[PDB]
Amino acid sequence: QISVRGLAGVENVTELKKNFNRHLHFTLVKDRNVATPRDYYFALAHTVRDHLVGRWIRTQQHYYEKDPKRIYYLSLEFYMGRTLQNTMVNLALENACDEATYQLGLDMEELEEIEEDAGLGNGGLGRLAACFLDSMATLGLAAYGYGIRYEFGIFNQKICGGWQMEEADDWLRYGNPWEKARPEFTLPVHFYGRVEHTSQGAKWVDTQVVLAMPYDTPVPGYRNNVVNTMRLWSAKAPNDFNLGYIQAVLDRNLAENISRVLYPNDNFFEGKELRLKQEYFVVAATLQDIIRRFKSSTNFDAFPDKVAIQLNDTHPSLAIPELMRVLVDLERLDWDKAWEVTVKTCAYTNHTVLPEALERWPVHLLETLLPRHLQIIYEINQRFLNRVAAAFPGDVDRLRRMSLVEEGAVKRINMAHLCIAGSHAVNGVARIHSEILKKTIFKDFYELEPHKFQNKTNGITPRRWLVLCNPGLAEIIAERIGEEYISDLDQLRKLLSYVDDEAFIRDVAKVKQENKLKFAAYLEREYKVHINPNSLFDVQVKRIHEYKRQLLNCLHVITLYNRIKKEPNKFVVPRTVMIGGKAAPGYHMAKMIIKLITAIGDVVNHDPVVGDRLRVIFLENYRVSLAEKVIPAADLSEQISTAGTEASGTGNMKFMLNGALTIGTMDGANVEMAEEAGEENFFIFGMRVEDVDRLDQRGYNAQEYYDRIPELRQIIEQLSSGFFSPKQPDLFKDIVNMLMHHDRFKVFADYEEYVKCQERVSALYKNPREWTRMVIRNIATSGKFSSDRTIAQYAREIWGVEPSRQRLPA
Amino acid sequence: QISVRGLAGVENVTELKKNFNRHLHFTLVKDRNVATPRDYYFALAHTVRDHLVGRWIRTQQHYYEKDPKRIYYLSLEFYMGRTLQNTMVNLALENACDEATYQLGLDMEELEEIEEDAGLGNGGLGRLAACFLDSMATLGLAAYGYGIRYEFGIFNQKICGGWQMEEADDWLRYGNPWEKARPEFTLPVHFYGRVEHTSQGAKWVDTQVVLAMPYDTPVPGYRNNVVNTMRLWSAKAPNDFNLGYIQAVLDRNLAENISRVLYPNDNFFEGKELRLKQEYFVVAATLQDIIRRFKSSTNFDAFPDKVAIQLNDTHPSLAIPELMRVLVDLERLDWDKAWEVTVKTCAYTNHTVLPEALERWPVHLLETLLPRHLQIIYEINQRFLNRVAAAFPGDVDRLRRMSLVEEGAVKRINMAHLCIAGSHAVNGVARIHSEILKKTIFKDFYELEPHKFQNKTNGITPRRWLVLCNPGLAEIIAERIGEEYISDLDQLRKLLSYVDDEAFIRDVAKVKQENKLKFAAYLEREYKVHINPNSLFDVQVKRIHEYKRQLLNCLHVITLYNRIKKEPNKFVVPRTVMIGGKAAPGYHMAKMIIKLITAIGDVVNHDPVVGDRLRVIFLENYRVSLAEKVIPAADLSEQISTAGTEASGTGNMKFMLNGALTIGTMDGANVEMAEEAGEENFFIFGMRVEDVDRLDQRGYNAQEYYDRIPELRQIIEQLSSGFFSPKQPDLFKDIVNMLMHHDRFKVFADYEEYVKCQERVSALYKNPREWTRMVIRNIATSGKFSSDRTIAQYAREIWGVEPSRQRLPA
Ligand SMILES: OC[C@H]1O[C@@H](NC(=S)N/N=C/c2cccc(O)c2)[C@H](O)[C@@H](O)[C@@H]1O
Ligand SMILES: OC[C@H]1O[C@@H](NC(=S)N/N=C/c2cccc(O)c2)[C@H](O)[C@@H](O)[C@@H]1O
Ligand SMILES: OC[C@H]1O[C@@H](NC(=S)N/N=C\c2cccc(O)c2)[C@H](O)[C@@H](O)[C@@H]1O
Ligand SMILES: OC[C@H]1O[C@@H](NC(=S)N/N=C\c2cccc(O)c2)[C@H](O)[C@@H](O)[C@@H]1O
């Protein structure tokens, strides 16, 4: 039906139909009389995956023959979402499959909804890994994603009595058609034990062994016939493990627990032994695999010419001492040469500045679990600090600040310090973030080795985040400027010459309206909740965190409610305020914020005076597949973190690409977004980084704001008095207390400017034509935020490889 | 190459070749350059399984349309072995696949060796279930096998320093191509909780729930296009299970442990809670599935006309109170009617008379785990004992003997008593065993309800146990009498008219020689052990148990060694004595017996005076796939259990069919084997049941035998003094002590007769022509021992259904 979804030729549709029937029969052992809807999904998934095979084998054969430099992206998170539609899109199969299934009497969109998300990540960091894999394949790089195949991904969120409940995400229950087990590459990983010193160096002995079994998932590039691999490791006990008899077999579970579940913390460090074991497990298995592939090309001088390892935050930081261990203990290279190889191979990306998120492992844990690695880390530290001492003679405080080892109650290893010392490149993920790294938290390191520090502003893939989720918008763009922009997003600048085009303006507004209608329909069918589709869709979706300031949004919502109640018969622009996102299960304040949101909704949504002028909805179970539905439907993107706290954000870029305007602080990539679009076309408010710093020097006093702003005082009194929780008057006492006496994120300080800025949003929305023209200016300048641009920069400035848009033969 | 392996037509071979290449490419994602041998096995398995699909769907559709009476065979064990060759044999695909793989440059027999045994059983009882499924499919019955899909089957046995070591049988590690998950039939199973009494009867509340997910495995009949189902349940936690967060997810393992591992006890009862949970799990899930299928045909009067449930020993005995529970508590039938339905539906097969093997569950366990079932069992007991009291007024001791509840230190429930009371038929598994049940252990029950007691002599499938494992013998038989005997084994009687046929005699002896050569070769390649293929192959393979008297065999072996040493230059018929079998991990005496066997081998096999006249070999890891190799190679089958202890035996029947002669006591099915072949054609020795009874009345004094038999005294002195363990002189003190003072199985009592009988064996073996003629007389009369005969008898005399040899359409 629509052009960007590909051709639906006679021969193709016929073939798809027969292969679908073949799989239903031979693979699923069903006929049409007894086939379940899930059977039909699986038949379609097998039919589509068949099309990957030839390209996958020949891509990997090609790398073996050409022997390019290989890129290894190490991450504990890959937030992939669903695979079916993505695969169809990248193979140009979508229209053909839609036709074939239609002719079989099936609705493809209904079948798509059956697939489980591969929810192997928490939020931004994990989703970035996923967009990166898509871009690396699209740019023809010989790239591999390596991680853990968690049996349970991020929990499913249920809301019960306004409270978050967690349920296990048993995503593999029905089987995963998009993976292929690779038993011949099963590898041993070592834990515990002790170190012996012989005549011929150190030996790590008496270890416990856990096996690492790989599963491969294909990563197709966009219409270039490249299919790269994401290899995820699963933990398996050896067969003689613990080998009364019954108990020994049941105890195999202990070893296999390593790959059982994803830790559900976003921007928070929990120093648990199981997490440390996960981090080593992925590193040890991955490095053996890398070395195997390198030898199957003695001379490790060429190792950095053939291998790049990208560390996604510090989670896989043990790659640095593990590589040293292998090179020194097993290959018998001298220290200095091994170190040279290591530094030239490894690069490190930082994703946060919050002190509580930084990984600082107790020495006693590393001592027991990884005794040889601790020794290696101590040696790295001594040689590094000797360099600092020679560079800054007499600066004893610099020495303690820069040390990999932190003294105190318990000695800890600072993993960020380890990564900087052992990497040739260190990058932040937006210009303001990278500057903050050089000026503040890694200032000492920047002074020692300025050349190591880079910026790589984040991006999102326009395949998933435009073509897939918003085909209507993709189509009206392609009608004017062709299809080339899908892999060259800068071409969207051409849309600037349509800002006065009356046909285009109408088409942009119509696509948004259809998306909103579709999402309003989704909300009634799946959740029995009724919303006005003519209202402004005001959306804040992201993990729940104090720094992201969902609370500031709550204050605005209560302000609007109070104003309506004060002057019931005055016109206001109708809004549907939607907030969604998961809270880490142990994060009490985040759980209270969810309850507050639902409690506000309970009052607002049932007030007869309000009517359909204001609705507050909590979007349950926010995840990639939900993002694909809500983002195209949004009018207003809330990006309101305290300046200096959101390293980049990527949700922000998704909204920009899909025709929502942004209300935001000058934080993370918001700064660069405003720069690209023009500040006139962005709703900027609030303190800048410099203003926050000034307030900190003076001391933040929340009482001052409470005393001088009557509208704010009223809200606080309502919260305290039990207006939003009649049967439990003091329910929100923790929230009020934090706001008044221990708010690290200065919610009150940005309140007045935020409310005023929100008034300007409502004003623009009253003029549909001018709203849409500003939207066009945003979409047209969103090109910089393609992860294709981001990856091309990593390739050229860090990995030392050239991207290629050229097709491999079919 | 050989006729019984089927046609290898041009069109078939071409098709197989292309489907093999298709699976290698699309399914395994490999080409010929990188394909591993395991890849080739999987390609072949997928190619063969494709041929099952149409027949499987249409068989099950046929049952749905015709609505015959369904047979449900409930077992905690199904000892299936490998599936690939069996499937080819039953589909007439063997020659075609052999040709196709040969043309691809592959050896099919090498590929076959890659498949893991499905080792979901311990020995005889589990293997019987497997032969039964094959026969029920071959006889066109609407039959279903129901059991547990254990993650770990019977352990792999390694011998280290002459001792058994156990290793986990991780049989699913690489994936099982012969199963199909059926997620839509996932069912809840309840545990713990408590009973509430309302106005409307009892209610079982506050339970913990575990999910039962079924996996289906096809069971093809022999060339009749019937494919029946074996449905095995796997345990899964519900998603809100235990739902700090991380621990709750890790604790899901506790629920899923139910299906983790097979209990490795053969003929021994271990009263463990995990085992009880396994027994209920299979029963509860199976009964819901049965009822679902029955309703999809309100009136339960017809239930026994449409359903038969066969209980394989008492392991699934909870089916009786579970059926009552469903009918009374859920369907609201009155007690008496529910009971009528239950009795008419259920039948019970007993497989042992050893008191330590009988299931007697502590009441306190049932009280906690299954409180409603305990109540139901008490009610059954009261109503049953009221019938006993009316039938035998004043016989108070009969009342305590017959009670389902046993008083004592801990009160227990006798599950055998439950099964008799709640079943319309009770059978033993050989004529002598069934008679012993009526005369001794169930005498009281037989007097009350004589009509319930039956015999069903065991059998083995001639597909696996002749055509598959011994194609050479199958072929020389088919050359003379055609192919019909494979599903009508009584036709082997026709071979009696060839007992004087010089061509046939030569052919029978040649096939044995080739089998022995092949097995001698297997032993050198896989185990680096050297054996003389001209020797008599003297084989005892079965689980290690005191009752099976591997020890008596050991005594004979030492006798032969001592005689050679006494007169080195006298001629003796050379022998290779092979003993194999697993010991239950907690069974100390059985472990000592294995060590003794290996210790004897250590002395005998390295004595220069002995030469290659005597060799003693322990066959490591005896299992179905090993039985398929060794049984065709055997000359002499050792079946030497103390009279009255082996209920039937089935290994005995396998040896008879494959051209070995039998040395045996008049125990289990040995009696009926001798009756069929003629006692002249069998090597019978030792006490009869009546002789054992006489010895028991008098008191068994082992010292008497020791005092009167000089050759026996010498062996005992050698064992005691450390002749067989120089560095640990007292190693075998436990063994000597047991033999001398607490031998329940009267090893010494049968020693003289056994040795004398073994001399007669050696004498016959010196005359190759007469040895072979006696073999022919055994093979020719082995027909009764087909499990087709056994199943036809269950069908007609217990289940009330007619078998059918008629083909379904292809
Ligand atoms: O069907 C469920 C099972 O599938 C198996 N995949 C097999 S056999 N081929 N895949 C081939 C393949 C081929 C192309 C693309 C692709 O993504 C996969 C996986 O190894 C199992 O872990 C999984 O449970
Ligand atoms: O490939 C490995 C996987 O195979 C799957 N089988 C599927 S998709 N079709 N089978 C179809 C089938 C078809 C005919 C006969 C037969 O015996 C099976 C099983 O459900 C998995 O548990 C297993 O891990
Ligand atoms: O760059 C991609 C995104 O990365 C995010 N970091 C995340 S999700 N975890 N970080 C750190 C972390 C995660 C888990 C444990 C821990 O100790 C630390 C940033 O907050 C975003 O601004 C950014 O857009
Ligand atoms: O009929 C088939 C075969 O059955 C065997 N029984 C076996 S393996 N377990 N029995 C009982 C058992 C098994 C496990 C636990 C338990 O408490 C009892 C008999 O010993 C054989 O003679 C017979 O040929």
From Swiss-Prot, chains A, B:
Coiled coil: none annotated. Transmembrane segments: none annotated. Phosphorylation of Ser-3 converts phosphorylase B (unphosphorylated) to phosphorylase A. GO terms for cellular component: skeletal muscle myofibril. The modification Phosphotyrosine is found at Y192, Y215, Y446. It catalyses: [(1->4)-alpha-D-glucosyl](n) + phosphate = [(1->4)-alpha-D-glucosyl](n-1) + alpha-D-glucose 1-phosphate. Belongs to the glycogen phosphorylase family. This is Glycogen phosphorylase, muscle form.
